[PDB]
Write an enzyme that holds these catalytic residues in place. Structure first.
Site, PDB file in Angstrom:
ATOM      1  N   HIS A  78       0.757  -1.256   0.000  1.00  0.00           N
ATOM      2  CA  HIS A  78       0.000   0.000   0.000  1.00  0.00           C
ATOM      3  C   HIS A  78       0.777   1.290   0.000  1.00  0.00           C
ATOM      4  CE1 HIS A  78      -3.470  -2.375   0.490  1.00  0.00           C
ATOM      5  NE2 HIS A  78      -2.975  -2.921   1.585  1.00  0.00           N
ATOM      6  N   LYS A 138      -4.179  -9.724  -8.857  1.00  0.00           N
ATOM      7  CA  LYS A 138      -4.991  -9.243  -7.719  1.00  0.00           C
ATOM      8  C   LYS A 138      -6.146  -8.436  -8.331  1.00  0.00           C
ATOM      9  CE  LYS A 138      -4.686  -7.077  -3.138  1.00  0.00           C
ATOM     10  NZ  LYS A 138      -4.685  -8.352  -2.381  1.00  0.00           N
ATOM     11  N   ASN A 192      -6.635  -3.097  -5.458  1.00  0.00           N
ATOM     12  CA  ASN A 192      -5.629  -2.658  -4.497  1.00  0.00           C
ATOM     13  C   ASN A 192      -5.645  -1.145  -4.406  1.00  0.00           C
ATOM     14  OD1 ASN A 192      -3.431  -3.598  -2.640  1.00  0.00           O
ATOM     15  ND2 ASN A 192      -2.174  -2.201  -3.874  1.00  0.00           N
ATOM     16  N   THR A 193      -5.416  -0.629  -3.194  1.00  0.00           N
ATOM     17  CA  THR A 193      -5.282   0.809  -2.960  1.00  0.00           C
ATOM     18  C   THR A 193      -3.865   1.155  -2.539  1.00  0.00           C
ATOM     19  OG1 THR A 193      -7.578   1.050  -2.374  1.00  0.00           O
ATOM     20  CG2 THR A 193      -6.034   2.717  -1.489  1.00  0.00           C
ATOM     21  N   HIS A 195      -2.719  -3.426   8.268  1.00  0.00           N
ATOM     22  CA  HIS A 195      -3.561  -3.587   7.103  1.00  0.00           C
ATOM     23  C   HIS A 195      -4.376  -2.323   6.911  1.00  0.00           C
ATOM     24  CE1 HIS A 195      -7.038  -5.050   9.691  1.00  0.00           C
ATOM     25  NE2 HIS A 195      -7.676  -4.377   8.753  1.00  0.00           N
ATOM     26  N   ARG A 212     -10.220   0.730   5.805  1.00  0.00           N
ATOM     27  CA  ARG A 212     -11.178   1.334   4.887  1.00  0.00           C
ATOM     28  C   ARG A 212     -10.639   2.648   4.342  1.00  0.00           C
ATOM     29  NH1 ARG A 212     -15.805   2.046   9.523  1.00  0.00           N
ATOM     30  NH2 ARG A 212     -14.690   3.677  10.682  1.00  0.00           N
TER      31      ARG A 212
HETATM   32 CL    CL Z   1      -5.154  -4.650   3.540  1.00  0.00          CL
HETATM   33 CL    CL Z   2     -10.500  -5.919  10.112  1.00  0.00          CL
HETATM   34 CL    CL Z   3     -13.394   0.610   2.085  1.00  0.00          CL
HETATM   35 CL    CL Z   4      -6.747  -2.995  -0.814  1.00  0.00          CL
HETATM   36 CL    CL Z   5     -10.404  -4.830   6.494  1.00  0.00          CL
HETATM   37 CL    CL Z   6      -1.673  -5.198   3.998  1.00  0.00          CL
HETATM   38 ZN    ZN Z   7      -9.805  -4.345   8.688  1.00  0.00          ZN
HETATM   39 ZN    ZN Z   8      -3.307  -4.797   2.565  1.00  0.00          ZN
END
Ligand code: CL
Ligand code: CL
Ligand code: CL
Ligand code: CL
Ligand code: CL
Ligand code: CL
Ligand code: ZN
Ligand code: ZN
Ligand code: CL
Ligand code: CL
Ligand code: CL
Ligand code: CL
Ligand code: CL
Ligand code: ZN
Ligand code: ZN
EC number: 3.1.27.-
Length: 129
Positions: A16, A39, A42-43, A124, A127
């Site tokens: 990311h 994939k 992806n952002t 991770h 959002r």
């Molecule tokens: Cl992620």
């Molecule tokens: Cl989560």
């Molecule tokens: Cl989102």
């Molecule tokens: Cl993503």
């Molecule tokens: Cl998530």
């Molecule tokens: Cl990630």
């Molecule tokens: Zn999450």
């Molecule tokens: Zn990720």
């Protein structure tokens, strides 16, 4: 998938972190090289890593899983969403969508030999607002 033995923080960076914007079709090749399959989505966050790890300092909020280890950014940032429109590896072709939105990252303490600079690091992307 995240290689065995790699930390979650390190994976997050590969997946990311993109401080200088790159084209999706180029950038997604390094995302796609571990499975060598395309994939779907992806952002990429167009911020320095230290600025995303600084978001781990904002008030704790629920993640999508219900656990209270997520944190929203102070402000909107530049990011790019990449969406797979056609192809098969190594020909993964993406449509980009450039946006200015806030985000929420899940954070945890660094692990193993992760840097010691940050006591909470993103693990991770939870959002994009
Ligand atoms: Cl992620
Ligand atoms: Cl989560
Ligand atoms: Cl989102
Ligand atoms: Cl993503
Ligand atoms: Cl998530
Ligand atoms: Cl990630
Ligand atoms: Zn999450
Ligand atoms: Zn990720
Ligand atoms: Cl790698
Ligand atoms: Cl590799
Ligand atoms: Cl980075
Ligand atoms: Cl848990
Ligand atoms: Cl604006
Ligand atoms: Zn690798
Ligand atoms: Zn949990």
């Amino acid at each position: 998938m995240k290689p065995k033995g790699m930390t979650s923080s390190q994976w997050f960076k590969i997946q990311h972190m993109q401080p200088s914007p790159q084209a999706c079709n180029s950038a997604m090749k390094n995302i796609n090289k571990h499975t060598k399959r395309c994939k779907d989505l992806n952002t990429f966050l167009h911020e320095p890593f230290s600025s995303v790890a600084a978001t781990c300092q904002t008030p704790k909020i629920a993640c999508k899983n219900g656990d209270k280890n997520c944190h929203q950014s102070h402000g909107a940032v530049s990011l790019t969403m990449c969406k797979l429109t056609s192809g098969k590896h190594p020909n993964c072709r993406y449509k980009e969508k450039r946006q200015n939105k806030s985000y929420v990252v899940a954070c945890k303490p660094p692990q193993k030999k992760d840097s010691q600079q940050f006591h909470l690091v993103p693990v991770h992307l939870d959002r994009v607002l």
